[PDB]
């Protein structure tokens, strides 16, 4: 019927067709109607941009790896062409990230009240994520800026999640995971990263026995990822 | 390596490695439009790029058209239909770009002695008309079905004259030509007889890249019976 439901139908059709730029364009339009998102709406927004930015991040890593190998060989003429393509992909990646960040700051985080803890944590975790993707491709003072913005967002998300969410909550577990990944991959702080991931895993597993079947599947999937990272990270 | 050709070729190889097939295809389109022959490597770049671009639209089109089959809200159905047609229009533009390339440059510039190029490009023409036929209706459908079969038919005649039955290009053409009969023409017997003769003629003459295609012929035939 209505216009918002029309945009949401577009977003789920696009998801089913694996047309994530269409999906992200639709969820962006939903957000800019300045009405809050339900739990399912937030997930459609997250799935859409995760896929759009993830395609760009994958492409960027491949071409940047080719760029480093071209520079080592000193093929200056080929390096200039690889660099131009890497920068093309990079600008797409940064625009996707800034689109998301604008939605979070102008709408989603902005319109949360202080008692919508799940919304706040969800949006602040996502702000941490998209600043972290910006950090992955930045260097120098540009990198330090988005790194500080990522950590600040993650930190506030985690304090709210600790104070208002059970250790088993998938969103709080997903935030601990991504925050520990931030420390390990972005900050090169393995001890901080392991300390965080291990605290999150131990806090969740003690209360896991109290979940219904469906809630247990969600939490354990994320806890297994925490456990895998901890094993990989301590082995170096 | 500063000219347009090497610039574009380098862009398409990078786009390949990055799985950015729209970039890849746009680069290969530009290469083709320089009006110079494609080597076998260049020809494979052009084919890989467009196969992937069209394959994403085809796969999206099947999903939505199937959701459109579930039709029991007028306003909800119309938006599914409108989305399916949006994808359809993307797919048509891709196919028509390919076919324009084949007709304006690739098939045209083939010399009489480049039978491999001719068979490969005419097969490609049958394929992309076949992709148009998968979504076309009415009189438009009849026109692209006829164009597909005529391209396939010509490539097959050249390949029957100048390639061994074991040649992968000719086996790949027989396979796709038989898919055209089965899927587009609803002609299962005619499809099975063509797949059968091709596998038969090849197994008579039995570089193991030919065996992989022969297995696909046999798979299709086992399925189609």
């Amino acid at each position: 019927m209505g216009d918002r439901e029309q945009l949401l139908q577009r977003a789920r059709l696009a998801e089913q067709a694996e047309r994530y730029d269409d999906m992200a364009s639709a969820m962006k339009a939903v957000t800019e109607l300045n009405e809050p998102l339900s739990n399912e709406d937030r997930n459609l927004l997250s799935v859409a941009y995760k896929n759009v930015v993830g395609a760009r991040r994958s492409s960027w890593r491949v071409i940047s790896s080719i760029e480093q190998k071209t520079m080592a060989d000193g093929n200056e003429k080929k390096l200039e062409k690889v660099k131009a393509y890497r920068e093309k992909i990079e600008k797409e990646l940064e625009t996707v990230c800034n689109d998301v960040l604008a939605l979070l700051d102008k709408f989603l985080i902005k319109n949360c009240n202080d008692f919508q803890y799940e919304s706040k944590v969800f949006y602040l975790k996502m702000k941490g994520d998209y600043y972290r993707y910006l950090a992955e491709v930045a260097s120098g003072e540009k990198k330090n800026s988005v790194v500080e913005a990522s950590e600040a967002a993650y930190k506030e998300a985690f304090e709210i999640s600790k104070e208002h969410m059970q250790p088993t909550h998938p969103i709080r577990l997903g935030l601990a995971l991504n925050f520990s990944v931030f420390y390990y991959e972005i900050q090169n702080a393995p001890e901080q990263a392991c300390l965080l991931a291990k605290q999150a895993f131990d806090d969740a597993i003690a209360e896991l026995d109290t979940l219904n079947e469906d809630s247990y599947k969600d939490s354990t999937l994320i806890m297994q990822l925490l456990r895998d990272n901890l094993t990989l990270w301590t082995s170096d | 390596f500063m000219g347009d050709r090497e610039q574009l070729l380098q862009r398409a190889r990078l786009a390949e490695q990055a799985e950015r097939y729209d970039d890849m295809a746009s680069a290969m389109k530009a290469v083709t439009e320089l009006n110079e022959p494609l080597s076998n490597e260049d020809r494979n770049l052009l084919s890989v790029a467009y196969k992937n671009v069209v394959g994403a639209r085809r796969s999206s089109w099947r999903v939505i058209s199937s959701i459109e089959q579930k039709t029991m809200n007028e306003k909800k159905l119309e938006k599914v239909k409108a989305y399916r047609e949006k994808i359809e229009k993307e797919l048509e533009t891709v196919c028509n770009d390919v076919l324009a390339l084949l007709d304006k440059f690739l098939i045209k510039n083939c010399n009489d002695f480049q039978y491999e190029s001719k068979v490969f490009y005419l097969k490609m023409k049958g394929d992309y008309y076949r992709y148009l036929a998968e979504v076309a209706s009415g009189e438009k459908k009849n026109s692209v079905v006829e164009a597909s079969e005529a391209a396939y038919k010509e490539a097959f005649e050249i390949s029957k004259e100048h390639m061994q039955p074991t040649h992968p290009i000719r086996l790949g053409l027989a396979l796709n030509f038989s898919v055209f009969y089965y899927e587009i023409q609803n002609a299962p017997e005619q499809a099975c007889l063509l797949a059968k003769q091709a596998f038969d003629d090849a197994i008579a003459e039995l570089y193991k890249d030919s065996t992989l295609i022969m297995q696909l012929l046999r798979d299709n035939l086992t399925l189609w019976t």
Partner: peptide, 22 residues
């Protein structure tokens, strides 16, 4: 290996393609 990353996109690579591949 590692941030939070599955649909019936799991049952995709099982699909049967009739035509030629590359």
């Amino acid at each position: 290996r590692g941030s939070f990353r599955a649909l019936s996109q799991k049952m995709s690579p099982f699909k049967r393609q009739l035509s030629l591949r590359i």
